[PDB]
Amino acid sequence: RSFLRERKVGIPQGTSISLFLANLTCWKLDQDLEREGVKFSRYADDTIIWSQEYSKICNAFNIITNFSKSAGIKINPKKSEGISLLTKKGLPSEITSKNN
Amino acid sequence: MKLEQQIQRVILEEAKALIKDYHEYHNRVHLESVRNKKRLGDSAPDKKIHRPNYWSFDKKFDPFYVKSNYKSIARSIANKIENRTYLPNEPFTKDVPKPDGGIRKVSIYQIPDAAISKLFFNRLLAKNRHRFSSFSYAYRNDRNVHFAIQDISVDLKKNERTFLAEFDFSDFFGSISHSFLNEQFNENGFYISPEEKFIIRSFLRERKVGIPQGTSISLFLANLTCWKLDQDLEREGVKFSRYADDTIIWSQEYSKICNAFNIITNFSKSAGIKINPKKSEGISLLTKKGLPSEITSKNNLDFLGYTLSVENVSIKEKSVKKIKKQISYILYRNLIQPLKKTSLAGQTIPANDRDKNFLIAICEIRRYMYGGLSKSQIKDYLSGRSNRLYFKGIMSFYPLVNDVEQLKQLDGWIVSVIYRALKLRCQLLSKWGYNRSHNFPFILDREDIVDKCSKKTIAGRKLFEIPSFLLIHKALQKGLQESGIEKIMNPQSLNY
Amino acid sequence: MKLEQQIQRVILEEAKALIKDYHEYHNRVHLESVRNKKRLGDSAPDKKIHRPNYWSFDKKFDPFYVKSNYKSIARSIANKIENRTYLPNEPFTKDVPKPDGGIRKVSIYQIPDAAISKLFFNRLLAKNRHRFSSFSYAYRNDRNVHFAIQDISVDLKKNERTFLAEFDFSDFFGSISHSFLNEQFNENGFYISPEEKFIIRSFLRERKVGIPQGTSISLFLANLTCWKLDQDLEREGVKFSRYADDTIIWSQEYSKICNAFNIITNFSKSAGIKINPKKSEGISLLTKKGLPSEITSKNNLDFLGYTLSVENVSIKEKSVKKIKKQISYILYRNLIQPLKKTSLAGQTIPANDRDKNFLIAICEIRRYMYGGLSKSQIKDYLSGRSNRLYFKGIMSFYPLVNDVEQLKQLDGWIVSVIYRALKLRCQLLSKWGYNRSHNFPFILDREDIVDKCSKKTIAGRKLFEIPSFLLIHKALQKGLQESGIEKIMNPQSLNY
RNA sequence: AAAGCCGUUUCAACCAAGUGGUAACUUACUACUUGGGUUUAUACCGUGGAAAAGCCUGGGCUUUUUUGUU
RNA sequence: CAUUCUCUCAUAGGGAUAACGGUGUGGCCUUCUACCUGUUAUAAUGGGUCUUCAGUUGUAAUUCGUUGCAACUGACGGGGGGGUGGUGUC
DNA sequence: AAAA
DNA sequence: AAAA
DNA sequence: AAAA
Ligand SMILES: Nc1ncnc2c1ncn2[C@H]1C[C@H](O)[C@@H](COP(=O)(O)OP(=O)(O)OP(=O)(O)O)O1
Ligand SMILES: Nc1ncnc2c1ncn2[C@H]1C[C@H](O)[C@@H](COP(=O)(O)OP(=O)(O)OP(=O)(O)O)O1
Ligand SMILES: [Mg+2]
Ligand SMILES: [Mg+2]
Ligand SMILES: [Mg+2]
């Protein structure tokens, strides 16, 4: 609480305690994603979720949206690439597709 | 006799309402003719009273004849109904313009038959509306289009990504299979007495498929037809909002929306009302303004005069064009059109910085948009200084619009169009031999029109203030928070 | 001022209603005292008029005092409300009996505060009922218990195997967190004006957790509290019907019902209203009478006076016991109880085959269940010979009962109990020195009671016919067909 | 051989097809009383009045009856 | 073929009737409202001012949800075509 | 072994 | 058509 | 609180 006193929102940048605070902040999101059955890998704000089912990935999108509304951390549409479909090099795809 | 008294009352009320409407029509036609002569001068056309054509087709169409002998008509109708021999007379069908879909067939039933249909529709709705889905907002005394728009807006604002599905039935009223309807009478715990059932079958006897267009009983039949569809959609867990044939379905899951598509297809195959491929947009994905989408995406959708997005509710673009057309035509009619005639005889030429035509145009715009409310009254209501404010204008038909930016653009458009129309009026006056560029209404720049027009005062009132959408929108929001959609649009009576 | 006039009207109407109720009370007490003296003779107790105790607690409790000066009270209330200093006076809380769960605390607010609560509840319900789920049937002017029972009955009859989940909230009114309530005011598109919000907070100021018991604003707050739960249950696709705390959830899938359980648990954790494991029956499986079940099974469910099975709707067993208690007590009071006194002075001993006490008992029984309708009137209505029939009896509280077998058993019980009570009356008369076994009411066998009683005629009317549940049930079914349940059970929109 | 079914006789106010046990109760216990207005006679809550009585004081209090109530 | 009244064989047919219905403006009552300024014995009449929203500041209550008050800050009338200038970048 |  |  |  002492390290958060100067500001009224957000955690300080460039100090160690903020790392633990960031890890602790995204615990409910991690639990929800795990219990959805999707595989994911979060590194600070950068998050990648991949599953074999479209419904699971849509639910993951909804879960991240709910978590953002709960914690007040909106997602920038620029850096966030949305939902895609990772196929092989020449496999036809029915929705937006990327090979890597 | 209980039935005969009811029929007498209904027929008399309907005939008296039609007579009052006709008297209002011809009185306002005379008043507008007087104003037109004061406007167009010697070129004004003569007053022309039109009685509706179908009044000559049959006497029972005439409200005056029905009011003449309504006891006899009601007595005969009751006698025929209780003999199970009653049959409504042939309606007058006209080709109502539907350029969007070609033509549409509307029917004007005779006053006695229309009254009987209204009475039995009221009864059937009263004893069965508790079985109708809460998400069917068409032809009800407890559901409005504004409730549907509020529900859609709230649910869209809750989430960020929604799967939509919009479907319009090709010919909803004209393709209902009568076998399906007669099977639906004993389902969902519907309470239809044998008399009401006989009346319903009587109104369907002339045709072999579909329900008549323009009777009240057809509205209840349409609501009853889509009960299994409503139950299936509810049991799927999707949120929907049906208004007659126009159906919107939205859910957070793709599988639910695909199942909703299948359910609607099955219902259409069961009832014979095929969907319209051109009007139905299909399955989409309603995202925010810049969110990437994996399937066909749209940032906003249209539903009954409202363009709904994720963030805000706005007027439909076609309705905005209608508003622009009406306001611009008011300006053209009161400012430019009189000056385009061959002669200016009998017209008042603006002079001494007093253009009555400009005042008339501004007042008529305020009447169209506000409804006659001065800015002082609206500001008083907003401040809480006053507690009474009446909402009857173009805005009362869109009480739920929360798009302040669109109203700002509309206000700017109004000011700019006023300035340009005034410039054209000045040019025409100069071409007619009158220099008035230095007088009040024309010397104003676009920036100073509102500021100077607010200060201008006539008869101790500010009749020259340019009306603004934002102010009446603030009044609408406060009204909603205090009165509620119903009362707000109560005078509006959207209907349509 | 608009507010002060509204408060005046509401307070005056409430006070006048209470005064009318009191006058009816004491007039009927005097009439029943006269009848009692004609019944018990010299052993009849004297008339005792009770004014309610809390009328002495404070003058504003007294309807007469409030009616004396209601303008002043309304003026002061409006002045305090506009100053945001209004605070309702302390109610009179008593120990209403709840032996099923110990005791229940109810509160009788003062007449002005109760009137204000009723007025603001009416306003809030009017401007917000379109947001309430259609499956919340408690404390509404558009829903009642009978609509819920009809919905449940139809849905259960549609299928054969349904997964149930019955839950009750422990002290639902008295455990709602105020933080949750204050957070709910800005959700679901609720339209609550600042005056209404301030009034709501005013009625919650005395306590810290939970809403008061015995005010209309409490009913609105209870309806508003369970909106997120209703939305979640609807979006799960399950069918449910919540009345106050009583919540019946039924679905065709086990997973949906488990998710409904989890949803209710989450809502309880969010609002702090825990579920009592005693009254909550948990998740069951409603099958037919002899269908094997793999989990905990029941063949019928109880919901607010109705025992609902898959095939038919029947009166709740406890309500059947109440009916039996009332009828048997009527017979005992008018036949046996007068004869058990120490002396029979002033009592009319039956003679000449004229037992007036038997006639009085039969008439009172008919009043209890039929409401005073003769079998001739009901048969005339059934045949269609007549179109007017009023439904005010014990069966007007159960219009949707379609269990003919249960009513047949009840009719047999009525006849048998009448016969046995008559036998006991004859025995007591013999013990008192009067042999009457050969006279009209006592010489009758059980088989011949109904026939001879129907044949009996007094004053040109058949006042001796033994009332039957089946006939009034047929009348109720026809009345439901010709008029929505709403009107039939309209005078019975209360509780217990 | 039964169960069962069909009789017939007898006991009971109901709960009770029940209880360790079995009676009581309706201004009770824990939701309603006749199709709507229109006035002869009956009559109610409370307050007035007039009579009587029984107490205090030397006029007041209490209880009954009458009247308006109606 | 009174749109008025009435009769009946009563979704049709008779009778006598000159009114029947309806509109704009005005007066009366009733709501109805902040402030400032004209005229009269203190009320009419005349002319003006402001009202909203968000944030911050400080203050008073709050049953801690919030509310009130005071002061500042900010928002509060579209777009399109042509010419032209400054800024911006190699 | 963990950031400025 | 909501409480006591 | 539906007519067209
Ligand atoms: N203003 C109105 N007046 C009368 N009836 C209307 C009005 N608006 C709608 N309706 C009726 C007649 C319409 O056929 C019906 C709604 O159906 P609509 O939206 O026109 O689609 P539809 O299935 O009839 O297609 P289409 O018009 O191409 O045949 O409601
Ligand atoms: N007369 C009433 N009618 C309707 N609702 C009522 C009434 N009295 C109380 N309520 C509300 C508030 C109470 O919490 C509840 C009464 O139902 P009840 O069966 O007594 O359960 P409960 O909610 O009191 O649970 P518990 O008895 O386990 O504490 O409903
Ligand atoms: Mg369509
Ligand atoms: Mg409960
Ligand atoms: Mg027994």
Q: Which residues of C101-112 are buried (b: 16+ CB within 10 A; e: fewer)?
A: eeebebbbbbbb
Distance CA C308, CA B290 (A): 53
Cα separations in angstroms, C6 against A6, B25, B235, C9, C139:
52, 37, 43, 5, 22
Backbone phi, psi, residue C461, to 5°: -135, 155
The DSSP letter of residue B55 is G
B159 is in an annotated binding site: no
| SS (HEC) of B289-352 | CCCCCCCCEECEEEECCEEEECCCEEECHHHHHHHHHHHHHHHHHHHHHHHHCCCCCCCCCCEC
- Under the phi-then-psi rule, with left for phi > 0, alpha for psi from -120 to 50, and beta for the rest, what region is B472? alpha
> What's the half-sphere exposure (Cβ side, CA atoms, 13 Å) at A71?
19
Q: 10 Å Cβ neighbour count for B96?
A: 12
CA atoms of B33 and B369, how far apart (whole Å): 23
Q: Which helix (H) or strand (E) holds B248?
A: strand B246-251
- What spatial distance separates the first Cα and last Cα of chain C, rounded to whole Å? 40
Instruction: Count CA atoms closer than 13 A to B141's CA, side-chain side.
Output: 12
Give, for B357, the enclosing helix (H) or strand (E).
helix B356-369
Which bases of strand E sit closer than 7 A to a protein CB?
2-8, 10-13, 21-24, 31-34, 46-53, 63-65, 67, 76-79
Handedness of CA A27, A32, A37, A40 (dihedral sign): negative
Give yes or no for residue C101 CB within 6 A of ligand 2: yes
Close Cβ partners of C157 (under 8 Å, ≥ 6 residues apart)? C310, C311
Two tokens, residue B402: 């929360």
Sign for the CA dihedral angle at C394, C399, C400, C402 comes to positive
Contact status, residue B103 vs residue B183, Cβ threshold 8 Å: no
Q: How far apart are CA C147 and CA C150, in angstroms?
A: 5
Q: How far is CA C271 from CA A54, B235, C75, C206, in A?
A: 34, 27, 37, 19
Query: Do B360 and B334 meet the contact criterion of CB atoms below 8 Å apart?
Result: yes
Report chain breaks in chain C, C–N > 2.5 Å, as residues after which they occur. none
Interface with C, mutate which of B144, B155, B191 (most C CBs under 10 A): B191
Q: With contacts defined as CB-CB under 8 Å, which chain A residues touch B293?
A: 82, 96
Contacts for C190 with CB less than 8 Å, ≥ 6 apart: C128, C131, C184, C224
Burial bucket for residue C308 (CB in 10 Å: 0-12, 13-18, 19+): buried
CA of B172, closest atom in ligand 1: 23
- Look up residue B116 and give its amino acid: I
Residues C106, C97: contact at Cβ < 8 Å?
Answer: no
Q: How many CB atoms lie within 10 A of CB B70?
A: 22
Quick one: tokens of C309? 């099975």
CA distance B315 to chain C (A): 19
Resolution of the experimentally solved model in angstroms: 3.5
Report the greatest alpha carbon distance in chain C.
79
Work out whether strand A46-50 and strand A39-43 pair parallel, antiparallel, or are unpaired. Answer: antiparallel
- Smallest CA–CA separation between B26 and chain A, in Å? 59
Alpha-carbon gap, residue C17 to C23, rounded angstroms = 10
Rounded distance from Cα B251 to ligand 4 centre (Å)? 33
- For residues B182 and B208, the answer to whether their CB atoms sit within 8 Å is no
Report helix angle C469-482 to C404-431, nearest 10: 140
Distance CA B314, CA B307 (A): 5
DSSP B44: P
**Spatial separation of the C-alpha atoms in residues C256 and C264, rounded to whole Å:** 12
Please tell me whether B279 is known to bind a ligand: yes
Protein-proximal positions, strand G, CB < 7 A = 1-4
For residue B10, the SS3 value is helix
What tokens does B372 get?
Answer: 């006659």
Helix (H) or strand (E) holding B469: helix B469-482
Q: Does any ligand 2 atom lie closer than 6 A to the CB of residue C169?
A: yes
Strand C239-243: give its sheet, edge to edge. Answer: C239-243, C246-251, C162-167, C282-286, C297-298
Measure the CA–CA gap between C357 and B283, rounded to whole angstroms.
75
Tokens in use for C402? Answer: 């379609």
Query: Residue B167: phi, psi to the nearest 5?
Result: -135, 130
Q: A93 in helix, strand or coil?
A: coil
Q: Which DSSP symbol is given to B47?
A: P
In whole angstroms, what is the distance from residue B74 CA to residue C455 CA? Answer: 43
Give the chains touching A; criterion: ≥3 Cβ pairs < 8 Å.
B
Query: Which DSSP category does B226 fall into?
Result: T
- Determine the distance separating the centroid of ligand 5 and the alpha carbon of B254, expressed in angstroms: 65
Distant-in-sequence, close-in-space partners of B114: CB < 8 Å, separation ≥ 6:
B14, B108, B215, B216
Query: Per the structure block, which two tokens stand in for A6?
Result: 């100067």
**Residue C427 to residue C432: CA distance in whole angstroms:** 9
Query: B94 labelled as ligand-binding?
Result: no
Write the CB contacts of B325 (distance below 8 Å, at least 6 apart in sequence). none
- Which atom of ligand 1 lies closest to the CA of B171? 23
Rounded-to-integer distance, Cα B220 and Cα B139, Å: 7
Label the pairing between strands B282-286 and B162-167. Answer: antiparallel
Cα-to-chain-centroid distance, residue C43: 34
Q: Is A58 on the interface with B (CB under 8 A)?
A: yes
Rounded distance between C-alpha atoms, residue C305 and residue C302, angstroms = 7
**Whether the Cβ atoms of residue B378 and residue B472 lie closer than 8 Å to each other:** yes
- Cβ contact B294:B386 at 8 Å: no
Q: What angle (nearest 5°) sits at the alpha carbon of residue B235, between those of residues B234 and B236?
A: 90
Test mutation, C235, C253, C400, C477, chain B, max B CBs within 10 A: C235
Please give the Cα distance from B375 to B387 (Å, whole number): 15
Radius of gyration of chain B (CA): 27
What is the C-alpha separation between C274 and B260, in angstroms, rounded? 36
Measured CA to CA, the distance from residue B251 to residue C236 in angstroms comes to 11
Helix (H, G, I), strand (E, B) or coil at B282: strand
- Our CA angle for B108, B111, B112, nearest 5°, is 125
How far apart are the C-alpha atoms of C275 and B443, rounded to whole Å? Answer: 75
C436 neighbors C182 (Cβ within 8 angstroms): no
* Distance, C-alpha B248 to centroid of its chain: 19
d(CA C176, CA C184): 12
Q: Is C173 in the pocket of ligand 2 (CB under 6 A)?
A: yes
Structure token digits, residue A49 = 């979720």
Furthest-apart CA atoms within chain B: distance in Å = 79
Give, in order, the Cα–Cα distances in Å from C400 to each of C291, C312, C412, C475: 25, 10, 21, 12
Q: How far apart are CA B249 and CA B261, in angstroms?
A: 9
Tell me the chain C residues in contact with residue B487 when contact means C-beta distances shorter than 8 Å.
127
**In chain A, what's the furthest Cα-to-Cα distance?**
55
Please give the single-letter amino acid code of residue B465.
Answer: E
d(CA B178, CA B193): 18
Q: Give the Cα separation of B97 and B102 in Å (integer).
A: 8
- Return d(Cα C429, Cα C350) in angstroms, integer: 9
Element housing A43 (H / E)? strand A39-43
Nearest-10 Cα torsion for B477, B323, B361, B382: 0
β-bridge partners, C461: C458
- Over its C-alpha atoms, chain A yields an Rg (Å, rounded) of 16
Distance of CA C105 to CAs B179, C109, C170, C200, C246, Å?
A: 57, 13, 13, 20, 18
Nearest residue, CA→C1' of G1: C141
- Residue keyed to tokens 């509020």: B150
Q: Which helix (H) or strand (E) holds B376?
A: helix B375-383
Phi, psi of C173, rounded to the nearest 5 degrees:
-70, -40
**CA–CA gap between residue C238 and residue C240 (Å, rounded):** 6
Bridge pairing between strands C297-298 and C246-251: unpaired
Tokens of B157: 């604002």
State the DSSP code for B101: S
| H-run or E-run covering B246 | strand B246-251
Q: What is the dihedral of CA B239, B240, B241, B246, to 10 degrees?
A: 160
The 10 Å Cβ neighbour count of residue B484 is 24
Task: Tell me the C-alpha distance between C130 and C140, whole Å.
Answer: 11
d(CA C378, CA C398): 17
Torsions phi, psi for B407 (to 5 deg): -70, -35
- Are residues C415 and C365 in contact, defined by beta-carbon separation less than 8 angstroms? no
Distance CA B245, CA C476 (A): 36
The torsion angles phi and psi of B215, rounded to 5 degrees, stand at: -105, 150
Distance of CA C250 to CAs B317, C152, C256, C258, Å?
A: 44, 9, 9, 11
Sign of CA dihedral C231, B402, B250, B189: positive
Query: Is C245 one of the annotated binding-site residues?
Result: yes
Nearest CA in chain B to A82: B292
Alpha helices by DSSP H, listed for B129-253, are: 145-158, 178-184, 194-203, 216-225, 228-236
Label residue C144 exposed, middle or buried (CB < 10 Å: 0-12, 13-18, 19+). buried
Residue C2: how many CA atoms within 13 Å on its side-chain side? 3
- Give the torsion through C-alpha atoms of B431, B434, B435, B441, to 10 deg: -100
Q: Cα-flanking dihedrals φ and ψ of residue C241, to 5°?
A: -150, 100
Starting at the edge strand that comes first in sequence, how are the strands of the sheet with B297-298 ordered? B239-243, B246-251, B162-167, B282-286, B297-298
Sign of CA dihedral B318, B322, B327, B331: positive
Cα C208 to Cα C190: distance, rounded to the nearest angstrom: 23
> A34-72 burial, b for 16+ CB within 10 Å, e for fewer?
eebebebeeeeeebebebeebebbbbbbbbbbebeeeee
Q: Which residues contact C25 (CB under 8 A, 6 or more apart)?
A: none
3-state SS string for chain C: CHHHHHHHHHHHHHHHHHHHHHHHHHHHHHHHHHHHHHHHHHHCCCCCCCCCHHHCCCHHHCHHHHHHCHHHHHHHHHHHHHCCCCCCCCCEEEEEECHHHCEEEEEECCHHHHHHHHHHHHHHHHHHCCCCCCCECCCCCCCCHHHHHHHHHHHHHHCCCEEEEEECECCCHHHCEHHHHHHHCCCCCCCCCHHHHHHHHHHCCCCCECCCCCCHHHHHHHHHHCCHHHHHHHHCCCEEEEECCEEEEEECCHHHHHHHHHHHHHHHHHHCCCECCCCCCEEEEECCCCCCCCCCEECEEEECCEEEECCCEEECHHHHHHHHHHHHHHHHHHHHHHHHCCCCCCCCCCECCECHHHHHHHHHHHHHHCCCCCHHHHHHHHHCCCCCCCCCCCHHHCCCCCCHHHHHHHHHHHHHHHHHHHHHHHHHHHHCCCCCCCCHHHHCCCCCHHHHHHHCCECCECCCCCCCHHHHHHHHHHHHHHCCHHHHCHHHCCCC
Q: How far is B244 from chain C (nearest CA, A)?
A: 19
- B292 and A81: CB-CB below 8 Å? yes
- Residue pair B150/B246 in contact by the 8 Å Cβ criterion: no
Of B46, B47, B51, B58, the closest CA to residue B21 belongs to: B51
- DSSP class of A54: H
Taking each helix axis from N to C terminus, what angle separates B70-82 and B111-128, rounded to the nearest 10 degrees? 60
Residues 6+ apart with CB under 8 A from B36: B44, B45
Specify whether the CB–CB gap between A18 and A12 falls below 8 A: yes
Distance in angstroms (rounded) separating the CA atoms of residues B358 and B449: 12
Enter the tokens of residue C385: 């010979």
